[PDB]
Amino acid sequence: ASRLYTLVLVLQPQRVLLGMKKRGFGAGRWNGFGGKVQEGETIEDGARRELQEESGLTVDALHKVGQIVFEFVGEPELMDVHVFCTDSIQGTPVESDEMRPCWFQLDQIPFKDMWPDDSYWFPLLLQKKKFHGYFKFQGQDTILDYTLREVDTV
Ligand SMILES: Nc1nc2ccccc2nc1N1CCCC1
């Protein structure tokens, strides 16, 4: 009863890359890069493809850092989001009709213009912790309840 999704954060020692969606899913918020996984495609392969297609970057090594399940009250399908980190990229991010990438110093993460769950798990990602999480939403701006715990293996 869930659909697989990937989310990739390009995290360097002093900055992180986010992209502003110009429309569709996530318009007007800063997002990591990702999307649905294809049939016959592993999750790690889906994440590499999604990062490259949406940001224009080429990634060597991806590290699995978390798994987050999203429930939207009333919607049957859960979103099972597999979160990845990387610091080994080649290229320059590309702005397209769909996405506007920007680098953010770690102290200037725009949490007020991101999703409400990001304020909870993003700090774990930034200090190299792995996590498993669950968030129940009503709409897109209200967390009804949640769980989030640090783990040794994702
Ligand atoms: N992190 C996200 N939180 C959301 C909360 C409510 C509604 C939608 C959301 N989308 C998110 N992300 C976009 C790509 C994966 C994570």
From Swiss-Prot:
Keywords attached to this entry: Cytoplasm, Hydrolase, Magnesium, Metal-binding, Mitochondrion, Nucleus, RNA-binding, Transit peptide
Free-text tissue specificity from the UniProt record: Widely expressed with highest expression in thymus, testis, embryo and proliferating blood lymphocytes.
Binding site for Mg(2+) 2: E50, E53
UniProt-annotated binding residues for 8-oxo-dGMP: T6, K21, N31, W115, P116, D117, D118
Binding site for O(6)-methyl-dGMP: T6, K21, N31, W115, P116, D117, D118
UniProt name for this protein: Oxidized purine nucleoside triphosphate hydrolase
Pfam families referenced in this protein's UniProt entry, alphabetically: NUDIX (PF00293)
Effect on the protein upon substituting V81M: Decreased localization to mitochondrion
Job description of the protein: Oxidized purine nucleoside triphosphate hydrolase which is a prominent sanitizer of the oxidized nucleotide pool. Catalyzes the hydrolysis of 2-oxo-dATP (2-hydroxy-dATP) into 2-oxo-dAMP. Also has a significant hydrolase activity toward 2-oxo-ATP, 8-oxo-dGTP and 8-oxo-dATP. Through the hydrolysis of oxidized purine nucleoside triphosphates, prevents their incorporation into DNA and the subsequent transversions A:T to C:G and G:C to T:A. Also catalyzes the hydrolysis of methylated purine nucleoside triphosphate preventing their integration into DNA.
Consequence when changing L148A: Reduces 2-oxo-dATPase and 8-oxo-dGTPase activities and increases thermolability
Family the entry assigns: Belongs to the Nudix hydrolase family.
Subunit architecture: Monomer.
PTM remark: The N-terminus is blocked.
Top-level taxon: Eukaryota
Residues reported in the UniProt entry to bind N(6)-methyl-AMP: T6, K21, W115, P116, D117, D118
Residues that bind 8-oxo-ATP: F25, F33, G34, G35, K36, E50, E54, W115, P116, D117, D118
Annotated consequence of substituting E54Y: Loss of activity
Effect of Q52P: Loss of activity
Cofactor: Mg(2+)
Location of the motif Nudix box: 35-56
Reaction catalyzed: 2-oxo-dATP + H2O = 2-oxo-dAMP + diphosphate + H(+); 2-oxo-ATP + H2O = 2-oxo-AMP + diphosphate + H(+); 8-oxo-dGTP + H2O = 8-oxo-dGMP + diphosphate + H(+); 8-oxo-dATP + H2O = 8-oxo-dAMP + diphosphate + H(+)
GO annotation, biological process: DNA protection; DNA repair; purine nucleoside catabolic process; response to oxidative stress
Outcome, altering T153A: Reduces 2-oxo-dATPase and 8-oxo-dGTPase activities and increases thermolability
GO CC terms: cytoplasm; cytosol; mitochondrial matrix; mitochondrion; nucleus
